[model samples]
Target: TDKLTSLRQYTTVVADTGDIAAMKLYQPQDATTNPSLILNAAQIPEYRKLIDDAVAWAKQQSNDRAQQIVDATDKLAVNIGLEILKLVPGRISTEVDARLSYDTEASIAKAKRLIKLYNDAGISNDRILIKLASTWQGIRAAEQLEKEGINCNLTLLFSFAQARACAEAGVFLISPFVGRILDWYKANTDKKEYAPAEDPGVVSVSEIYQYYKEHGYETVVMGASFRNIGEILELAGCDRLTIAPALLKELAESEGAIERKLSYTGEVKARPARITESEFLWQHNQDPMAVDKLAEGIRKFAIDQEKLEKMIGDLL
Candidate 1:
């Protein structure tokens, strides 16, 4: 009870699922969705109508049909997000094309397209955050978008350098992959496993949290991809944490005190932090693990994107 009491004071809980019905139960302040989440929802019998209508509408359009399907996917993503927005007053993060991760200009173009689509549907930019992969290229794309008043959430984040680059670019938020870090630790080490505070994932996020706070970065950090309750509990005071419905349910069921464990006000100010264009590129090149992992993540998502496109094609 104490932990939950303290946690609620500092952390902004976000629901990380496509099931809109679960949003009310979790009472998350905001929500995040990616292509994979949308694809998952599109297959459900209840949500299939949305996907079918999108496919049918795309087929009717005379322009490049592949582009139409892609547009439909974006529209469907926004439609679902808008519906969820009605329940939660906070912003909803809808992602950009994973295939565009390495193309700064293309990513900016698609991001604008998505924003225009949402705006046409009467959703203001203030209520939506465009989610982009945290590549050096993606960060640059975000910088361009931000100049035009488009806020962004940098996802697939795994390193301090990525966080630094994103923050310096004035990104609105970043979702660090806490669960994925835990997976990396398990795969690399021969240790048995870990509990929340001791989890490698938790430690990684904690370090990022401390670094960001100490440096006075305006970009908010939301620790994501949790594997268990301990990970969630350990990061109780993170600026924000996106919990899947399953984990949210578990947290709601557990009768315990959650407490605030991180803060910015008390941290020591580090040296004059800077991220020049050259420094960004060099740091990215130096972190081979981050570079390789980011590429692999993009490829995996691109594959799923292709699969979704095919499914939409078949329906047409």
Candidate 2:
């Protein structure tokens, strides 16, 4: 059997793209979208109608130009998510604005607005996972939302600090990035390549999986950001994996015997003490890789968000 077919036995494969067409092709269980992916999809001819529709809806709701842009962007995100949900059998993750990463209240407010858009369109909160950065404030926002019966997908996670905090807060899911973590180690150490077993990114996620399973935390670990098929295969038994279309295509074509690399079993260790806001921030600050990548991820997303706003502005 092809590796992709074999993989389904051990893990839930999620398509990590904003393009609905790609999601249709891959038929992943779930789909995840970011500002960058949404911005990229907005430029495609097939998705232009979504943009146009969102802009039209925004115009009817708000006469103020700034408010129109904001409303339209939110609408576009939901529209894309709505379309993707039609293809994927499971939830779709729609991210809160990267600009709100540091503001717990604003993140919560934006999350509620996005959920309202989905709810108004007849999509339930069960079919949605509001994606947020893994900052302390972002985690706090997710904590509040989860209590209100809203699920969240915490993204841009790098350190144990972020993962432990999310697990403590009862987050629905967390996307601990494998590729970005690998990128940091390679750039810093000048290592050119790594076998999947030796890859730092793979190691990080594996450790996190064990920690979560050992503590019996209910938060799902959906490994994200893969640089190669090897990295994906290395994490075979993770609760979920969000793969880009390019890698998904490769896995679909490759024939191989795949193995399950992780599972929850046997005697488990106790978790560390619950993480506080100060500890979260200090630990996050202590990890150079997490600090740099978290900021970089937020900046990149914010830049794409601004570009997306400009695109919407042009239409208006």
Candidate 3:
């Protein structure tokens, strides 16, 4: 008998954490790391040296507390990202300052600085994708950066309007936050839990995936922020899914009852959709969920970044 392959096919699994050792073990094709993951990993004993060295290097540059610590954290993040890149064969996504998500010029400036930092380290732009939040300004910044041959990944997305705006702006990729959607739904519905197919998060990503595929949007749709294996299986054929190591281990160990769910083939061709470059702000304003989530995501990241910066400062 032929070898029994897993039921799912054609999905590209991407690691979503900054833990380099976990990444090496899982051996995902591509990897994406963000400030939160970096901050979380830096707390581990194995990563403490990496963080200390980065802080020491920053102290040599200047004695100012906030600037020095922020710079050190960013440098640490970039260095960790580069280290992970050596293990994954495909791209590594490095995020811009979440605090600058609302500022177009600032986002672009930071993105350029990040690209230059990578280039200075001998890593080419082709291997790096600067990740930006999916705010109106973030999309605008990515639009400009893309014209200069720098690719982008617009993350923290939760609504169709955000996806539409990113696609219209010709973004390289967009990450729809699947777990956050589940969180929102369960909270709003009085803590009601859902099964795999009935999961609000999975349904959200599936809708975004189908919309992207049927409309021929070249912007890659990656499902992000997953909570369970069920959501992952539901989105098996998606372009990409950024999964944590714990979840990846679960999928690897579970052998039986796996089944393929999503497919773009034989899908009905959708009509041409009107997505405008200039209407991003208006469309975002029109969608209450998009507006609320974008603001909430940025605020949450900003708070975490501040806490991280404070930790670095106190240590220094």
Candidate 4:
């Protein structure tokens, strides 16, 4: 009670699930979703109608089977966004297909298409943050989108290089993952466990938060994909934290209190330059944790994306 209430004063809590029930219970400021979450939601017989409605809309859009199925997937994403936007007070972050991550034009067009879906339903641009993978192309796609007044949340962000580039590009937000970074270090490094203060993921977000604040970048830092309540608590003062429902429950039920843990106070070592494509690529590639996780994360997303498409294809 006090724990969750106190933390909310310092950070904007965003729910990281597609389930409307969780959103209703947690009352997060915003919500994030992907194909995986949408797929999970579709399995609930009550929500299957959203999927069927998307299928019907796709049929109206195209005649080709392949294009229609793909279009249905896009509609399904928007449909979920529309439904959840009713529950959350703020925006919804809806991810585009992972298959388009490397294709800047396709990714840009995809973002536009999803926005158009919401717009057709009479929703404004401010209510959605199109989520894209943190590829060079994806960042550029977001840059173009931002210039056109559409907001984007750069997801799977793992490196300082990516963070710097996204900030320079005027991206609306960057989801610097906490749990995923710890997962990488645990898999490859000698250390197995970390105190909350020393967690690799927690440390990464802290560094980014300080670096951004030290120089006054406007892009929001939303710590995401957490594995434990400690990681969440350690990042209590981040601009935002997209927490899964289980961890949110833990925070709400715990008796302990949490203080603000992150801020900018001239603690950064140095300000990195606004980078070029090769520079971004080089620096991001230099960090093996970033290289491996960004790739693996995209692949995992694409896997679920494929299954969602298959489910749509079967229904078609």
Candidate 5:
């Protein structure tokens, strides 16, 4: 069997792009989207009609230009997600605005609004997972949403602190980014290349996976932001791996023996019962890699979100 088929024996593959064409090709079990992915997809010719429709709908909703633009962006994200749901037989992760990462109330409100958009389109909440940053506030907001039966995908997660907090908060899933973690280490360390077995990013996710499995946390671990097929294959037994289209294509074409690198058969250990805001902040601040990357990731995502909004404005 090809690596793609073999990987499925141990992991649920998720398409980590907003392009419907790619989703159709890989046919991932679930699909994930962010502001960056959506913005990139919006510029494509095939998705122009979806963008135009959202812009037109927003114009009818409000007379104020700013309000119209904001509404249009939300509508566009949902529209893209709705299309993706048609192709995949699993959930679609729709992200909240990066600017609202620090505001718990605002993040929760936005998640509700996104879910309402899906509900209005006749889709159930069961098929949707609201994506949020792994900020302490974001985790708190996700805790509240999960109580109301809304699942969440906590993105931008880097440290064990974030993962533990997310699991304690009852989040449905956490996306520990593999490539971004490797990017930070490469820029700081002398070694430019890493073997898959010794890769920092691969090691980080493996550690998180071991923790979750040992503790029996129901929160899912989805390894994301892969730099190559090797980083992906290293975490083959993860709950899920959100892979970009290029890597997915490579896996589909190559027939390789894939082994299960992770599993949970150990005894559970006693640990903290919960992580308060103060403790979460202190733990997050203690890690330089996590601190730097989390801030940078949020800023980059916000930049792309604005670019997307500007594109919609020009269309209007």
Candidate 6:
């Protein structure tokens, strides 16, 4: 069997995309979409109809400009996810507005509004995972949302502190972005070449997995933003992995043995501890890579989020 087939035996593979066609091809159990992807997919000829229908759905609901874009974007996000649900049986992750990343109160309110959109569209809460940035404020927002039964996938995470904080907050899942971690190290350090097993990203993600399992934390660790299949192979037994289609196809073409690379062995070695906001900030601050990537990630997503708004504005 191909490597993708082999990996499926251990890890829950997710398609990190907005392209419904890719969803039909890779057939991941779950799928994730961000502003860039949602906008990217809308530009494609095959998916333009979705954009068209998405805008119309919002048009009748609003008669103003800003609110029009807000409704259009939110509905389009859910609309794409709604269709993806048909192709993939597992839950779909629809990211909250990146512009709301640092505002806990606004993020909480937006998450609920997004849920209300889903609720009215015949989707139950369980079918959607609200994707939020893993900021201190973002985590708090998710903490409250989780209490209300809104499952969350904390994204743009790059450190143990971030992961642990998410665990303490009762987040349903965390996306430890493997490629972004590696990129930071590459840009700042000497070495460029890394064996799949030794890549900094592989090591970081692997360590986070061990930490979660050893400490008996129930938060799901999903390896995301991979640059290559080797990194994916290194994280063979992670809770879940969301891969772009390029690597997904690569995994499908290669023949190899995929071993279970990550798991809890022996007794649980450590107890999970709660991390307060200040501690979470200080601990996360110590990791240069995490701090840089987290900020850069938020900025990048916010840019895409704004561009998406422009697209919607033009459509409106």
Question: Residue 125 of candidate 4: its Cα lDDT?
Answer: 97
* lDDT value for model 2: 0.94
Write down the worst ten-residue block by lDDT for model 1: 1-10
Per residue, candidate 1 scores C-alpha lDDT tens digits across 28-112 of 8899988788778677677776676666656666478767878677777777887789889898998888999999999999999
Better of 1 and 2 by lDDT: 2
Q: 1-316, model 5: which lDDT tens digit per residue? A: 8999999999999999999998889889899999999999898898888998899999999989999999899999999999999999999999999999999999999999999989989999999999999999999999999999999999999988998999899899999999998999999889999999899989999999999988888899999998989998889899999999999999999997799998988788776679888888899999899999999999999999999999989877
Which structure is stronger by TM-score: 1 or 3?
Answer: 1
Alpha-carbon RMSD to native, per candidate: 2.1, 1.0, 3.0, 1.7, 1.0, 1.1
Steric clashes per prediction: 8, 0, 0, 0, 0, 0
Residue lDDT tens for model 2, 76-193: 9999999999998999999999999999999999999999999989999999999999999999999999999899999999999999999999999999999999999989887879
lDDT of 1: 0.81
After superposing candidate 5 on the true structure, give the runs of residues whose Cα lies further than 4 Å from its correct spot.
Answer: none
Task: Give the better candidate number (4 or 5) by lDDT.
Answer: 5
Between candidates 4 and 5, the one scoring higher on TM-score is: 5
Question: Roughly what TM-score does model 6 have, to 2 decimal places?
Answer: 0.97
Evaluated against the true structure, the overall lDDT of model 5 is 0.93
Q: For candidate 6, give the lDDT of residue 173.
A: 95
lDDT of each: 0.81, 0.94, 0.81, 0.91, 0.93, 0.89
Report the error of model 3 at residue 210, Å. 1.5
Model 4: per-residue Cα lDDT over 199-265, one tens digit each: 9999999998887888778899999989899998899899999999898888888886678888766
